Each structure stands twice: as structure tokens, then as C-alpha cells.
């Protein structure tokens, strides 16, 4: 037993504890990544709207004012 | 008979719990009546009612064995309708009941009078309905026993026990109970 | 012996846990790649927006 | 550098100028006055005072309101709320509520949801009114769910469920926990987490009566098979067996053994003590 | 007997590897939190600009017509 | 005897390989996250610049056409 | 009631005012004002959780914007109407999203069409329990995404298409898609560790046609790059092949159970393994 | 149904009428309408899977739009034409992308010229099987990025440049770049963990020139970065140096195989080790 | 072409043209053209690798924008000039960044001022090694960030300033900072796991003052945070405390050596442990 | 000579590498001169020059022992300055040299005549500069050995060898050399 048994048990238990902590960390990380993905998705649309609005407005107003 | 929506509750007091029956409010029924309780289309069970001075109207209380047999959850909705039993064709003459100790605390090898116990059965359980597969508790000299209905003789699925019915006991497998009496086989 | 049986069971649990962690890591990697592509698109759109707006100010201020 | 004395003096000068400008009242006067109010508020926020900044922002918001502009009033109200955040909670609550009222008129629902979550954090961190916190979280969850943002409408529901479990309303917590577990079960990514919620549901059941816990555990194992080979289900089975014969030593032994490998937060320990005291007797 | 010693060496190497992985995980978590805050800060800007542009456009249009 | 002996010698190498693979995955993930962080910073700067210029131009045209 | 009743009353009032103004006009400012109040009424409906009326109002506003010479606003109103209708009756949601997709693709924007096609496919699969049209929509979305060199989205859509097609007994298409994705993802240093999965699935499909195809394909895949020769999955494949060669089903069941014990199986894998077992 | 018959017919009709309208102009509204029609025709052709027509239409629109004072739009059309042409004939894509890059840099926007250079380099390497121009483009992009303190992207570009330069037997450049990147990454909280790898690579290059240089360089990097003294790579380098010091190829091969077992060597490392072993 | 000579000559000619054009103008409408030509000259110089002239041109453009009634453009030109000068003349970079910070904070925007303050502190620490000014700038940035409800950035800045303060033998200041962050990290779902580390560092600072303050602080953290008890750092601290009490320098050295062998330490930890070692050795 | 910058190169041939004389270009110097190669401000090593055809002028070629002693890498910058010996104090009378096996393959237990080798040493590098600490190779009959200068007796750091050098050799550090003769201690 002696060193053999003591190393066996202690190292095994410590390894298991560390593995469990890693498990928890990764679950939380994945949830955070999901939420951020949805925020990015919502930003994209509001950027496209603004692009179309500005382009159309500038074009039309320029034409109208030059014609006047 | 038409059926109403009733709610499962916890049986009041221990004595009513050892007195096998579904407990109802004094405003609706009395004791000795027969009803069928439906929790789903495919499993319905017949019970006899008893009134208690604590049951809240709109609910029916059951003891632990009845809930463990019928698979009921406290607070769940069920339907109950009065049922009318024939007496000329379903009367039980003799039955087979498997018996064992209810409390593991004190197993013993002493002899138990299976005859006297059977008579006490009639004393306590006369005029109550029993079905195959139903489980119950039996109080005999301050001892708790678990019983399981094995067979019924007039074969009938449900019947009303009469005073002169005879009960036979047989030890459950893997038990040290030494039974000695007429109620054997 | 029997204590080595405890240890064999321990090793089995370790193996299962590491496999699960590996799957989680792979999925996180894929998710990050997709998000990176979306970020790229947003950045590309932004610049256009900026320039198109500054042109308008200039032309209309020259007009006024 | 300049110290709060000079900044406060300049803020008071700006406030006096704005007040006199509004006194001799037209559009130019009011617009210039609101501009001065904004500048004074910024200077105050630089000065580290936190009440005069709120007052300035609120007055500017009221001026923008009386003039036919809305968006600007909402922005000034939310800024005033952020400023009061440290000065006085109740004024912050009022300002944020008015901001949400203005926002929701024109269909900007997500912003209203965020402001609701902020009012809720206020009510739960300094004030002790949990009921209002639950109401606000429910409103935010509904607003988010209305836009298919399921991924951000599941945090508010979990917080609501936890607070309702603390209060002893167990049916609501059970319903929310099951629903969320069933929803997350299907998705491949979130599957690994689902195991928690089901466990947390069973405990709530176990608070009412043991038989309900037995039946519920059976239902969840049938519905979802991986649950049957985790460590939480082992503990549930062990406790449900142990507490059927009034044997508290086994109960405490199992709890301590589980605690050794992994520590338990406040919620779990409170629930386990409730269960032992109530039922094990 | 001496091949068991190898087990000991393997166990020590495994433990070192696990520690390194844990530290990496901590750093990743902190970085993700900060990025999330930045994304929140950007959403509001986008909203405000959209609103302003729309309002001003309507204003010009009506004014003209 | 040698049954349970060869078992550990083969229950160890698997763990070694899996752990090394996890190591590599995490290093790549961290690099990617850092690059995305810098991209986000650039996007924020551009957004703030654009919004402020838009406000200036809108207010300018508003007052210019108010005074006409 | 409380909010619900008053919101309903104001919504009906706004609808009545809109009808009055449209019948009055039958100018341009009248139509603009009518569309504005239509939108406000729809938003007020959404407060009280009455989705049908919201969708009706949104579609009416979309039509009003259509008759006037504006398009983007019509697209926005149509897509919002579809999203609102996603609750009661999916058919109208499908119709509205189709109109929005047509309008968007006309102008030359191909990113948003992919999103809307994906949403339509999700509705089709989840509510109408029909998979052919889901396949069509997913393929269209994959093509649009790949057009702009956004490879990852194309890969995701094609993986879904391949899975559904393989479920429905059309194997060759699934084999082609799996080969393409597996070979493409191998090169990139990031996704290198997942490729071993895709090849595995391809092999299973070959094994549903005939054993010899499975053996040849396994050899070819192992040659294509050697990491796939890791004992983990190739060992299972070889054992399954050998068990099927000598008409021994007990060994097959033992091997599958042993692999299952260490790691749980998914519905897809269990179904495919059951078919392979049966044919034996 | 998305058949290309009607799509092609419409596209050709639009192109023909645009050519007619532009031809009649022997004031500038004709150019504007012609350019808009050209853009719509290009999008139509792109829908039709015919990419060459899309490229031609886009380039014609770009030319017509650049004819006016406006230039910010020529850039955009040219980059779009390049994306389109990236399928059939890469040579034109290079020309268009370069004409784009030129305008962008002239305007003062440097961050968005490095991206186009990276794209051109990828085209060159993947299809024209030429590496000198790839190196040139990567170096230019790295310079532009490092101008704007975007260190990470500059590091990635320099890594690719160093890899190819080492591939082409220009060792000195590779070693300088690798040591620069290693030292820079050593002082960071996150990248720290990878910092060992680069040093290992550098050591290998030092080996190709001469063994003693490699020994002294390993000593120097171990002293400079103590955590490097325990990693696997340093141990492997010590063993290979000792094996190569006594004309012992056997132990060299044994160590190489032992290190291969745990982790699979890439093409780069295996080719470099083969060169070293061919030395002696 | 890539030729640097031609590009620089063209830049010089264009800059001279702009100079003479503005000088003629001085004899508003033309000032705009002067600004645009200055910006083009600056960009050409930047592409010509002559960073000094690029910074100078950007500064001139900013000055031209200031006299005209525009500010935001002046701020942008100042920040560009600072980024250009950064490589050659750090002092002018700091000057330009400071002016831009003043303008920005005057206009109302705050976070941008925090970013520029962080940049100024970074250049101070990397080039002129003046630690006190770096501490001042970091504290100002943290104040702004905390005033805008952004917590993580404020925490990062506070950690940096605390590290330098401990470096400069101002122990008390560092200790409070660490404790604050620790409590915050205790009340979070994610950061919880790292929260021990901060506590550990705080303990070491106490040990620098007295060993009994350190023991009492360890007890306080133990009762406040029980998870701290299992971790290695608590065991190491208790063993070191005992060894210091008993005066057997050898046990302290051996224990620290073993802990180092298991894992390496940063310069900060090694220097602090060495200071404690030197303190204890005098006792023996 | 003056200290100009040179570059280390590879020995042109094995024979010149074994000669122990730094190969140089015929255009720059004449055989027999000495140069105190200056690398670091605190690192200067005395080497004797010998010309050989080929080699590009402006570089100096060294054998593996020289590069391993002075720590030079091919392509590194070095300074070459000429050195003048002080015949009144630098003249080497005796020297102490540690000897050991160079190649573990050729270990043998045969006897070694310590005197017979000594004369060959004189025969080889007579009149050549040697410095304390220098490492070199020794060509005994079919034997390649490693030599290390430990001590010099007329103590000086550098000197010029002559023909009266009775170098006593002694094995050290687990050496298996079977040494015979009177030239030991």
C-alpha cells in the first residue's frame, strides 16, 4: 500500500475534482456564447435597415433638389 | 352515480388510515357506500367511503397503501361515481390472501394463529370490497402485517365480503414467518 | 484487488468525463467560427454606411 | 484638478443662465435652455455629485416633453435614472417607469424589457420587495418571448422560478422548471445542462410529499433516459429509500457524501433542510 | 513492479495537464464577459441612430411636399 | 493478474491522448476569441463616429431650413 | 380585463378611423396617415396577446404601402405579418414570408433570403410534418449562402439536407454531401478534429446498400487521411463488417451494446444500425 | 421553379436596352439610368448561375460610373466583379481587385486594403500555384495592418510569410520572423501558452544550417524563457542533437517515431525532419 | 509604384502647394480645401514611412479645424496625430492625446476618454517608466468606467493599479483593492472559481507588514469564504506561517521550493516571497 | 591585425581541421602569426593562423573544437586583432593536459605508453601558441582522444609551446584508459 495506495487514492480524487470543475466552466461558457450570438443577430438587421434608408433618402432628395 | 370532479387529499388521523376506506366529508355521504374512482380511461378502482369530522368538502383522502396501489398524486384531479354491487352472483365465499410482516424492525419465528387472525379479519373488514392485487395493512396484537389479495371465490373481479367468509394465509417468499392455523394452503 | 476495482471504476468515470468535455469543446469551436463570420459582415457594412453619410453632408452644405 | 468647488460654481452659473432664459418666455429660448441644462448635468456628473445631476436631467426631460419631442425625453429620463441609481432608489424607479411607458408606445419592446430587468435588480438588491421583483421579471420574460428570443427569455423564467420556490409557491416553480428542461432537452448544444433542471424540479415535488417525488422521478426517467445515469438521480433514489423508515442517520450520511465531492449552494441546502425537518419526522 | 512506477509518472503528467487546462478556461471566461459588455454597448448606439435617421427623413419629406 | 495489469496501462494512454487534444482545441479557441475582440473594438469606434456625425448634420440642416 | 379591454377598444377605434379615411380618400397624405394608424393599431393589438388581428392589420398596411410606390416598407410589413401569424395559422405565415422573399431577392440582396427560407423550412417541418418541402427550402438557402462565399452556413444547411434525405432512403445524395463536407473541413486547422465523424456517417450509408461498398469506402477513406484509422470508430466498423460477413448476429448485438455502454447513441444511429442488423 | 431560361432572356433584354440607351448619348441622366440597368442585369445574370456575364456587366457598370466624378462606387462595382469572376477565370479577378485596392488606398483607408491583398494572395496560392507573389502580397498586407496597431492580424500574416519562406530554403527570414513573434507573444496573458511552439519551429530551422547553431540557440531560448525547458519539444531537440552528434541514425528514427505516436506530425514538420535526417 | 522616393517627393510638393495656397488665402471657403489637402499630404507621408511629417501634417490640420467652428474633426485629427507620433516622439503623442481627451470629456462622451487614458498610461509605462503617472491615469480611467456602470473594465484597471501600488511598497492601498474585487467575484456565477486567487494575493501583502495581521486576515477570509479552505494556497499560507513562527528558515525554503516545482510562479510572487524570506531570516 | 570584422566559416578540409591551426585566406596574412580573436568585450581567445587554398578572403574557418570552445556560430560577427608574445614570460616550458576518450565506440583496455605519445605532441605543434582552457583532439595510433589544457608551467594564461614540454597525462572522471609508462602524475 504505502506510497502506492496513497498516491492512487489522492491523485485519483484530485483528478476527478478538477474534471468536475472544468465541466461546470464549459456549460456556463456555452450558455454565454449562445446569448451573444443572438445579440449579434439582432444587430445585423438594424444595420441593414439603416443602410437602405440612408441610400434611398440621399438619392431621392438629391434628385428632387437638383430638379428644383 | 353521475360522477363529480374530486381531489385527492391526505387521510386524517391514524385510526381512519388503518380502517381501510376512502375518507369523505360528512356533507356528501356516509359509510358503507361503494364508488368507482377514475383517473384515466384505462385504470379505474372501486373503493368504499367513510365520513370523518375533518375532511374538507370537494376532496377525497387516501392512505399510503391506497395511493401506492392506485398511483395517485396529492392534488391531482379524479372522477368519482357511485357504484351498485350485486349480491347474488359476486358474493365472496372464500379468498386467498398472501401475508407478510409490514415492519422489518422485529422479525420473529414465533407461531402465529392463522385461524384466529382470520376471524379478526371478519371483525374488522366485514362489508368491505376487495379486488385482486389490492394491498393492505392488518393490525393484530399491536403487530402490522402487509396483505395482498391473491384469489377470490364466490371467479369474480370485484365483490362484497360477507360475515361468514373464510380467509387463508400463505407466507410470502423469503420470509421467516412461522404460520400455524386453519388459514393455510 | 478489490481496492484496484474501486480504482478501475474511478478510471472509467474519468474516461467518460473527458469524452464529454471533448464534445463540448468541439461544439464551442464551431459556434465561434460562425459568430466570426457574422462579425466580418457587420464590419464590412459599417464602413459603407459611414462614407455614404459624409458625402450627403458635403453635397447639401455646398448647396447651402 | 479643478476640484468640485469650481465645477459646482460653473454648474450653478449655467443653471442660473438657463433659468433666466426660460423666465423671459420662443423655440430658441427653450432649446438653448435645455442645451444649458444638459451641459450643467454633464459638469455635475464630472463633479461627483449625484443628486443635482438627476434634477438637471429631469428638468431637461420635462422641457423636451412639453415641446413636441418624445425620444429625447426618454433618453433624458433614462440618463436621470442611471444618475439617481446611487442617490435615491425610488426616484430612479419612477424615472425608469416613465421611460418604459414612453418607449412601449411606439413598439420598441426589447428596450422596455431591458429597463424592466433593471428596475427588478433595484427592487431585489436594496429593497426587500421580492413580489415586485417577480412581477417585473414576468413582464420582461413575456416581452422577450413575444419576439421569438427564446434564448434570452429563459433566464428571467429561471429567476422567477427560484424566487417562487423560496416563497413556498411550489406549483409555479415545478411548472417553470419542467417546461424549461423539456425545451432545452431537444437542442443538442444545451442538452448537457438540462440534467440540472429536472433534478431541481424533483426536490420541489419532494417538499409536498414523498410519493409525488417517486412518481415524478419515474416520469422524468421515462421521458428522458440520460437522467437515469447521472449522480443526482442516485442521490434522489437513495434519499427516497432512506426516508421511508425514519432513519435520519442515512439521510445525513448521503447528503454529506454528496457534498464532499461537490459543494452545494445556499438554495440546495435550504431545500434539503426543509425536506428533512418537514418529512423525515 | 518497476512498470508500475510508470503509472505514477503518467499520473503526475496528467495532473499537470489538467491544471494548465483549468487556467486556460478561466482566461477564456473573463474575455467572453468583457466582449458581451461591448456588444451590449453597441446595440444601443445602433438603435438610437436608426431612430434619428428615420425621424429626420420623415421631417424633410413632409416639410418639402 | 496480467488482466487487470494491462488494463491500467491501456486506461492511461487513452486519457493522455484525450487530454492533449483538449489542450490544442483550447489554444485555438483563445486565439480566435482575441481576434474577434479587436474586430469588435473597431466596429464600436466606427458606430460612434457615424452617429455623432449624423446628429451634427441633421441638426445643421434643421436649423438651416428653419432660418431658411 | 384591465389593459386587454382598453387596448382592444383603442385598436377597434383606430381600425374604424382607418376605414373612414380610406373611404374618404378613395389624398396621398390620407393614405400615409391610414397606413400609420394601421401600424399603431397592430402594435396595440400585440399588447393584449391577440395575434390574428395583429397579422391582419400588418398585412393591410403592407398592401397600402404596395399600392403606393414604395417597396422596402412593404417587405418589412409583410415579414412582420408573417412573424405575427407564426402563432395561429402557419399557412398565412408561409404566404407572407414568400412575398417578402420575392421582394428582397428582386433588389439583389441574397443574405436575407437565406434567413427567411430557413424560417419557412422550420415551420414546414415542425407544424405541417412534411419533409420534401423542407428539403427544397434548405437546398435553396444553401445555394444562396454558398453564392456569397459564406461557407459555414452552407455547410450547416447541407448537413441538415443530407440527414433528412438519408432518413428518407435516398442514400446517394447523402453520401455525396457527407463526402464533400468531410473532405472540405479536413484541411482547415480548426475543424480538423470533427471530420472523423462525417466520414463515419457516410460509411454507414454505404453499408445500407451492400457490404462490399462499405468495405471499399472504408479503405478509401482510411487512405485519404490516416487519422481516421484511430481505433475508436474504425474498430467498430471493422467488427460490424466481420460479424455481417459470417452470418453471426449475436456478435453484432454484443458489439453494438458494448459501444453503446461507453457512449449513448442517437436516434439516427440506432435506426441505421437496426436496419443493417435486420438485413444481415 | 427557378429555370434559367426566362432569367437569361430578361438579362439579355436589359443588357441590350441599356446598350441602346447609352449609345444614343453621342444630360448625364442617360449614364445614370444605363448604370442602374447594368447593375440590375448583373444581379439577374448572377441569379442565372452564369458568372461570366455577371462579371462583364459589373465591370461595364464600374467603368461607366467611374466616367463621372463619383469614384466611391467604381470601387464597389469592381470588388463585386472580382467576387463574381472568382469562379471561371481567376486572372481577371486579380486585375479588378488590384484596380480596387489602388482607389481605396488613394482615399486614405488602409485597413480595408489589407483585406483585399489577403484575398488576392489566396487566389494566387490556390489556383495559380505560385508562391513568390503570395509572399509579396502577404508582406504588404502585414505592413498595412501593423501600421494600424492591429497586431494580431499582422502576426498571422507574418506567420504565413515565414512558413512559405522556410519552405523555399530562405531560412534566415523564417528564423527572424519566428523569434520576433515568439518574443512578442511571450509578454501576453492569453497567447503565453502557445508561445513555446514558435520557438520549437525556429530551432528546427537553425538545425538545417548547422547543428552547433541549433545547440546554442536552444540554450539561448531556454535561458530567455525558462518554461521552455520542460516542454516536449525541448526534450526532443536534445535527443535529436545527441543522436546527430555521433552518426547514429537508429536512435534518431526511434525518437522521431516515439514522438510521432502520441501526436501526428504535419507535412511541414515531417519534411523538415526528413531533410535533417538526410544530412546524416 | 512601391518607390519611396517618388512618393515622398510628391508628398513634399503637395504639402508645399498647400502651404502656399493657405498663405495666399490669408491675404473660409479656401480653408476647407487647405484642410483637405493637408489630410491628403498626411496620408501620403504615412504611406511614405516618414511618421514625423505625417504627425506634423495632422497637427496642422487639427489646428486649422480649431479656428473654424468645428470640434469633433479637431479631436479626430489630434488622435490620428498622436497615433502617428507614437513611434518617434512620445512626448508629442502624449500632448495630442491629452488635448483630444480634454475635448472629448468636454463634449460629454466619457468611455472614449477612458480608452485614451489607458493608452497614455500604457505608453508611460513602456517608454518613460514613470510609475506614478501610470497609476494616476489608471485610477482616472477606472473612475470614469465605474461612473458609467461598466464593471469589468473598472475591475481590470483597479487590478493593474493595485499591482503597481504593491510594487511600490504602498501595501495598504493594494490590500483594499484586492478585497473589494474578491467580494464581487464571490457574488458571480462565472468568476466564482477565480475568486480565491485575489484573496491569496491580499494575504501576502498582510504578511509583508506583520505575521499576526496575516494570520488574522487568513481567519477572516476563511470564515467569510469557506471554499478558500480546501485550495492549495491556504495550506501553503498556513505552513509558511508556522515555519516563520518557529524560525526554521529551512522549512520555509523547502516548502516554497516544492510548491515552485509543482508549478512555476510569476516575477511578482517570487519577489514577494523573497521579501518575506529576508524578513524572517533576520529573526533566526 | 587592427580588429576588423570577420565571419566564421567551415573548415575547408579534414587535414587542416586536425592541424589545430585556424585556416585563413592567403591574401590577408602569413602562416605562423597569432590573433587574439575578440568576440565579447570580456571574451578574447588566442589562435594561430595557417593559410590554405580556396576560402573567400574576409572570413576565418574553424574546426568543431574551436567553435565549441569559443562559442561561435556560422555567420556571426567577430573581431580579429594580431597578438605578440612576450618571450621572457610567455615561453611554455611544460604544460598539463587532461586526456580522455573521444569516441565511446573505440574504448579498449590495451596499454598506453604515456612517454611514446609525448614526443609526437612536440613533433606536431612545436612553436605553436596554446592557451589555458583550450580543447583539442589528439591523434594517437588509431585513437581519437579529447584533450583539455588545465595548467601550464614555464603560471600564465597563454604561451608559445617549445620542444621541452614534458606533458604528463592523467585519466579522470571514470575513464577506462589503461595507462602505463613514467609520464604520469
Author numbering:
A (entry chain B), F (entry chain D): 191 to 258
B (entry chain J), J (entry chain K): 1 to 154, 171 to 201
C (entry chain C): 19 to 82
D (entry chain G): 0 to 24, 34 to 289
E (entry chain A): 19 to 83
G (entry chain F), H (entry chain E): 0 to 25, 34 to 287
I (entry chain H): 0 to 26, 35 to 291
Task: Provide the authors' own sentences about this structure as they appear in the paper.
The membrane-anchored SNARE (soluble N-ethylmaleimide-sensitive factor acceptor protein receptor) proteins provide the energy to drive membrane fusion in various cellular contexts, such as intracellular trafficking and exocytosis. Supercomplexes of NSF, α-SNAP, and either a syntaxin tetramer or one of two binary complexes of syntaxin—SNAP-25 reveal atomic details of SNARE processing and show how sequential ATP hydrolysis drives disassembly. Six NSF protomers come together to form the active form of the enzyme, a homo-hexamer.
To improve the resolution of the spire reconstruction, signal subtraction and local alignment were performed as before. This approach improved the reconstruction of the spire proteins to 4.22 Å, enabling docking of a crystal structure of the 2:2 syntaxin—SNAP-25 SN1 complex into the density, which was of sufficient quality to assign characteristic side chains, to identify the SNARE domains, and to determine their directionality. Four ɑ-SNAP molecules bind the 2:2 binary SNARE complex, with two SNAP-25 SN1 SNARE domains and two syntaxin H3 domains. Regardless, these structures are consistent with the notion that SNAP-25 SN1 is a critical initial mediator of SNARE assembly.
